Amino acid sequence: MEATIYDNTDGEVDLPDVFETPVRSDLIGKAVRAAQANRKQDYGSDEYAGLRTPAESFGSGRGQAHRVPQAVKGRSAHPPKTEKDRSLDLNDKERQLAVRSALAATADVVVSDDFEDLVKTQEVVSLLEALDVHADIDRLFVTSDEPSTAARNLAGADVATASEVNTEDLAPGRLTVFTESALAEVAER
Amino acid sequence: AKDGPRIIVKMESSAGTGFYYTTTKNRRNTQAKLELKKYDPVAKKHVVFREKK
Amino acid sequence: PKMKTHKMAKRRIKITGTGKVMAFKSGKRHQNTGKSGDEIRGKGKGFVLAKAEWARMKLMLPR
Amino acid sequence: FKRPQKVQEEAATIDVREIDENVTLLAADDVAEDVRDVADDADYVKVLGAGQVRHELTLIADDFSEGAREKVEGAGGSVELTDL
RNA sequence: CGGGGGGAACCUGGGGAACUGAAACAUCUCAGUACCCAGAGGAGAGGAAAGAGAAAUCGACUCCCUGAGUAGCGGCGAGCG
RNA sequence: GUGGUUCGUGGAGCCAUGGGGGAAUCUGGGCGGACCACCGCCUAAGGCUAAGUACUCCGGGUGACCGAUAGCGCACCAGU
RNA sequence: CCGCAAGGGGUUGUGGCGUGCCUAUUGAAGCAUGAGCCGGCGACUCACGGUCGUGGGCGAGCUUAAGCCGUUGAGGCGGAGGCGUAGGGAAACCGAGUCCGAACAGGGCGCAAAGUCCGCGGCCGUGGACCCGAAACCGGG
RNA sequence: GGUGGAGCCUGGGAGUGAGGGCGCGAGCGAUAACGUCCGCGUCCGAGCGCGGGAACAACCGAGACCGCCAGCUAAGGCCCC
RNA sequence: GGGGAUGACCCCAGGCGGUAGGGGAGCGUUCCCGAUGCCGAUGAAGGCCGACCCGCGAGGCGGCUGGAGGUAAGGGAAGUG
């Protein structure tokens, strides 16, 4: 239904069954996770400092008790194993499904192709005057085969493309504008 | 089993060659060479079985 | 990674999807037993319960 | 009871009601009079009997169960690989 | 004319081990691991076939995934693979 | 009589050799795992060959890494 | 003494009843151990396997290595493979039948009830893998 | 069957794998031991924490979710503390 | 178990000592989100004291301290008590 075509006064297009549907949160979140998940990095506590030196665990009989664990500045105990497989690879079908129902959630705004031409960030200022809002504040930049140039850098920069943009991209609580071949992304969908 | 050169020696028989055989334990005890009884090789059925081995 | 006392996997040891397993009768024979005939009538398959668990398990993966 | 090493021969589990059905799907291609040898769930084409042969098709496969081939007779035709 | 003397860790070759697991321990495993050595480098390794495999098929050597924890080695025991 | 190999002496080969024998140059000669016949494969018993993987003294970045009893043990007249 | 007043605050004379605390113990004040005081360090985790529970995406389901895309730097495409799709056998091989055997007697199975990937979780195998704790063997010096 | 509420199978996650104390029936054992050995009930488990029998797990009563200025009883007590 | 609106309320049944140990459910701790989240020189934090909240592990809050922060109404993470 209400798939509003930019260039305001200008026409209307239709919301497809795909986005239409009803929504899958557990999954959405899943998507998210998938995201930061494979992105993070990793950490560690010196193998050397931790099991390096020569420890003389003072025999016995003498009034004491024993390079090992539990005295100080060393040992670690079960540290930021630089040795810990950080990845998290969700799963293709899972994921894309995600970008999917999520985007549905987004439908809850229609970049009229012509726009792939506008050549100036002040021009942005312009389309902006055209439809500003807090949702606007959300603001996500989407072109459809190779970016809407200038559009790409402003108090909200970013520019995904008709192929290669995803929940990571914006399912994240935001609001936006994808260019029609971006609806080609639709195709992907 | 427990190879005993005692009056207890293992032995088996044949079906005229009904082919193979079947399981028996025996005693020099009485009757030496002696050893005849009948059976059923996979060969047909029955047959003369001599037991010596 | 992983494995099976590939051994018991091989001598005795196989699973029917039921998630159960069998091995050979094994009650005597194949060593001593001047013993008998009808007893020989004793070597088709044996199905040990519960324990067919360390069993199954340790084999897990292939068989 | 296993071997001193490798070798191994082959053939494989494919079948009757199985093909009449998911093959019903197979209709996307050689599923008219049928010319069979999918490429969508198996590896080395034998066909188990059971079910009730249908769809009138001929198979370029390896072979099929007793019942198999027979009901096959019931509603189609047989075609065995390289040389049989 | 060239050498050698270095060098944290990496490479290859020379030499080359007990604990520990097998709930002992002689096979075995720890390993061709640790170490010591000679030496080349910036990377060495290796590298166009007395190969592969067998569909009359493939064609450097290496390195990832996969093949297989399969094919299998074995006081067929731990395990190794 | 040993090695590698997945092979622990094994039905047990290929290559590599310790010690003795000590061939053939294209109908040559090994090879496909004992061996034998036929086939299929390769052409040894000289050499060079950047790139595709490793590594970190050193330079850069970055971190759901640290905050001085934690980080390399040493953030500064410390391997002293 | 009443900065939350006819109720509490602190202190206690008397009186009642009353054996510390932790380990390991048939059994514990303990005269068995542990520990003199206060402050900071300090011990069931990670990884890959596998496993059963479940949250959820299709039931055939699912992903490598990579190639490309990358303030944010965006994921996408990769279809060797591997787990369900019948299995019975040692095998030949047959096959929803199948082994034994030559007998219609039994064992395995058929019977879809179908998985499958991913997520988090009780657990198991290999890992130094709840933490420190000795004698000692071995290597080079 | 008055009962009421345990009963059974399937599967994941467990601990302890050595106790003792009493009554009773056997052993042994000097019918000796706060001995031990099995057995039948309970007991106790570092809290089966209260009562008592002085004091005393632990033997008789008794099951402790929590209510200071309530009441009926156990066993056990009622000259005094 | 008898309705439950989301609470909650009501009746009774119905117990509720508990170590190894098995199941549910909460608490604060320094981190990553600032899921159309930002307080603070008239104080961030930590400190110092307290006769409102919680069963509680904690909250709040008011007073004095001290110089600069850092919170997150919610999920994620772990060198956590």
Give the closest-approach CA distance of B2 to chain C in angstroms: 8
Q: Report whether B35 contacts B52 (CB < 8 A).
A: yes
The dihedral sign for the CA sequence D20, D24, D26, D32? positive
Give the closest-approach CA distance of C3 to chain B in angstroms: 38
Q: Report whether A184 contacts A163 (CB < 8 A).
A: yes
**Structure token pair of residue A116:** 């792939």
d(C-alpha D81, C-alpha D72), whole Å: 17
Chain G positions with an atom below 7 A of a protein C-beta are 40-51, 55-58, 60-64, 69, 71-79, 83-90, 92-98, 100, 102, 106-110, 117-120, 125, 128-129, 131-135
What does DSSP say about strands D13-15 and D46-48: parallel, antiparallel, or unpaired?
A: parallel
d(C-alpha D29, C-alpha D37), whole Å: 11
Q: Report whether B32 contacts C44 (CB < 8 A).
A: no
Give the closest-approach CA distance of B24 to chain C in angstroms: 7
Cβ D3 to strand E below 7 Å: yes
To what resolution in angstroms was this structure determined?
Answer: 5.5
**Structure token pair of residue A62:** 């003498």
Contact across the interface for C34 and B1, Cβ inside 8 Å: yes
d(C-alpha A47, C-alpha D76), whole Å: 71
CA distances from A166 to A28, A80, A151, A163, A189 (A): 11, 31, 19, 9, 11
φ, ψ at A178 (rounded to 5°) = -110, 140
- Structure determination method: X-ray
Count CB pairs under 8 A between chains B and C.
14
Question: Which residues of C in 15-34 have their CB below 7 Å from strand G's atoms?
Answer: 16-18, 20, 22
User: For chain D, which domains are there?
Assistant: 1-84 (3.100.10.10)
